[model samples]
Target: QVLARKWRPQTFADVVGQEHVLTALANGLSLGRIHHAYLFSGTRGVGKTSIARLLAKGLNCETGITATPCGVCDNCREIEQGRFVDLIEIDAASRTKVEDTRDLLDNVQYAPARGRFKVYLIDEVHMLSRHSFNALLKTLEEPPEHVKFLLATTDPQKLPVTILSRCLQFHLKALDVEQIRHQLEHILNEEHIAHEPRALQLLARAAEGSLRDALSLTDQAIASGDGQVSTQAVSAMLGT
Candidate 1:
């Protein structure tokens, strides 16, 4: 797995930043007050998708629904590996046809094949066509007990109000420079890689609050430095 996936938050506690949003989710999980639909909105590479996966894991954990899920359980591991039958990931951008949405939700009422809930993770949900959104609206208004909708999008302004009204919306802000640097240091330390503090500063600033982008840059930085992360090398690599 890439560092992005390797370090993706497994539980709500593991997630960095976004305390405001996670607080609500964590409390809901503890009380088993999971809503049928949720909309996580943020710029690209933020924790929207990562947090969604964590929620899905919590919903399907064998032990029960809670803020913290036991990763050792089959459902958790399978979801982490992206092979769980109950967890369905849909890319609405490429398939916005009404027929396609219907096909994906054909078995909406059926019991989960191997987990407690069926998770529908729809990426770029705003990309769906008018008719497609209308078809999805009915289901979102009254989904099955075993179904959970996780919608992610960078542009919330384009989404239909009806769709927005049906789901709980959480807006994720861009990460700060300090927050990005702190996380980079933690990951580098765990990976046993030596790095100059100034090099981390460069990466943090360049990341623009996207941890995934920072990690990808770090991966390339490691390669450019031939193992170590050096301020001089990183500056040159970034054309500074």
Candidate 2:
């Protein structure tokens, strides 16, 4: 297993390239100032869902969202493994119907599990039709006290203003080459993956502002290098 999947950051401090967003979230978690609903908009592969999950981890995490998840906790592990009862992640791209939105939100009246927040993560929410968005808007405007909505999308322009106005919006920006490389270096060292910083830096530049892309590129690099990655290895993997 390469480093990205094995040692991906699950803490505020460990997450790189989105300092502004993390800072706000960490502060909110620490100060108990979390909003009931949030809309996280960003480009693809920019850690949108990762941040959402981490935010869920923060609110429900036993250790504290201050910076880490008590990985062993039932809430944290269940969420990471996609088995959290209170935390729901629905792919808007796949379920782009009013019925789906209705059915999902209709269930929110139920109470939460062990966690403090009942998180609903909808990715690519812009894919929903107008009727579907309207259906989603009701819950967005006035959800249950325990319910929290976290929406993610690459293109916010396609979303309705009504839906946008209903919730707190956070725009997650892309990372620069330097920031991406530095993060990769930290992950690699943690995982004991062999690679030169310059090589990883090149891979980061190739990733072009997406942390997920950089880590994915590193995955292919590790494979070709047999865990001994280098600049040449990454270059050849990129077909450079």
Candidate 3:
């Protein structure tokens, strides 16, 4: 598997950065103050989508809403496997039409099929058209108690203020060089891959705050270096 997918954080605790986002989410779950809609704004390759999935699991976990979900439960497993019936994941970049948005929101009044909440996870939500946003705003204004909207976008400024005002927003910060380096080291060690610290340093800096990019670079470096990662090999691979 590619390092990016293989090392993707499955649980909130496994996530590297975004403590501010995690803390607020955990507190809200533990306190039972869950909001009907949430907007996660951040650049690409950050943990916005991953964190949103974690939040969905927290809300629907069989043990009840919690900060930490039992990953072993049927609800958690289905969500993790991306087969949860109630957790509807939509890529707005592809389905940006008003018809698509209206069709999705039309089912908002219905109860969740399996879990306690029917999570609508819309990725790249900013790509939706103006009419689609208007359709979305209607539901956001007065959503059903059993439905939750998890919106993720790399560009939040493009969204209408009307839609923005109805949701709780969390801006996920980019991971720093040190943060990416540390995570790379941890993953390499776990996979028993040979690597030099200097190589990781170069990869981290080259990643420019995206852990996914760093891991992908590492994967390329490993392939070019014949399974071992070295500073000289990485420098040559990066054309440095």
Candidate 4:
């Protein structure tokens, strides 16, 4: 697997940043203040979908809904592998129609096939048209307790206020140069890849606040250098 996919955070603890979002989720899961729907807004490569999947694993963990999920359980493993039946991921960008929205909501009433909750992870939720949003708003108003919705969007401005108000919304701030730099160093060290500090800094700056972009560039840097990252190599690769 590429470094980007291989190094994707598996748990909340593994996430490099976004402490506030993680803390609130941990407290909510521990206190059982689980909301029916959640909306996470951020730029590309941020931890929106990662947080959503971690929440899904926490809810369905056999040990119970918790701050710290037992990673070894069958439910957790399946969710991690993207094979869980109840954890449905929808690309709102592709299915941007009222009919698609209705079709998705039609299964909301049925109980979960294996887990305690059925999770609907809708990516790029802002892509939904007005009519599709209207259809989704109806279900969001009174979703079944057993069903949880995780909505992620890079552009929150496109979403309607009515849809925004129904769910718990959390915004992930764009990463700064320092945040991305530190994470890149940690990842490279863990992988035993040799790199220059200046090289990592370039990678961080090139990412422009997206951790995913930084890591993807890091992978390319490593390959270009035969597993070593050098300032000259990164500079040439990035045309900087």
Q: Which is the leading candidate under TM-score?
A: 1
RMSD of 3: 2.1
Residues forming the 10-long window of minimal summed lDDT in candidate 2? 95-104
**TM-score ranking from best candidate downward:** 1, 4, 3, 2
TM-score of model 2 (CA atoms): 0.89
How well does model 4 score by local distance difference test? 0.85
Report how far residue 13 has shifted in candidate 2, in Å: 1.6
Candidate 3, residue 5: CA error in Å?
A: 2.3
TM-score, cand. 4: 0.92
Q: Give the C-alpha lDDT of model 2.
A: 0.78
Candidate 4 structure quality by residue, lDDT tens digits, 156-224: 888889888888998887789998999888887888879898999999999998898888999888877
Q: What are the RMSDs of all candidates, in order?
A: 2.0, 2.4, 2.1, 2.0
- Model 4 pairs in collision: none
| Candidate 1 structure quality by residue, lDDT tens digits, 1-240 | 567668877899987789898999999999989899999999998878888989899888999997899999999999888888898877777844546565776546457887889898888889876655766787887788888899999999898898888899999888999999999998989999899999999999999999878888988788787878899778878974
Count residue pairs with overlapping backbones in model 3. Answer: 0
Q: What does candidate 1 score on TM? A: 0.93
Model 3: what TM-score? 0.91
For candidate 2, the C-alpha RMSD (Å) to the true structure equals: 2.4
lDDT of 3 by residue, 1-240 (tens): 778778766668888889889899999999999998999999997878889999999999999999899989999989987899999887878743546565776656368887999999989998876655776788888778998999999999888898888889999988889999998998999999999989999999999988878888999899888879988889989984
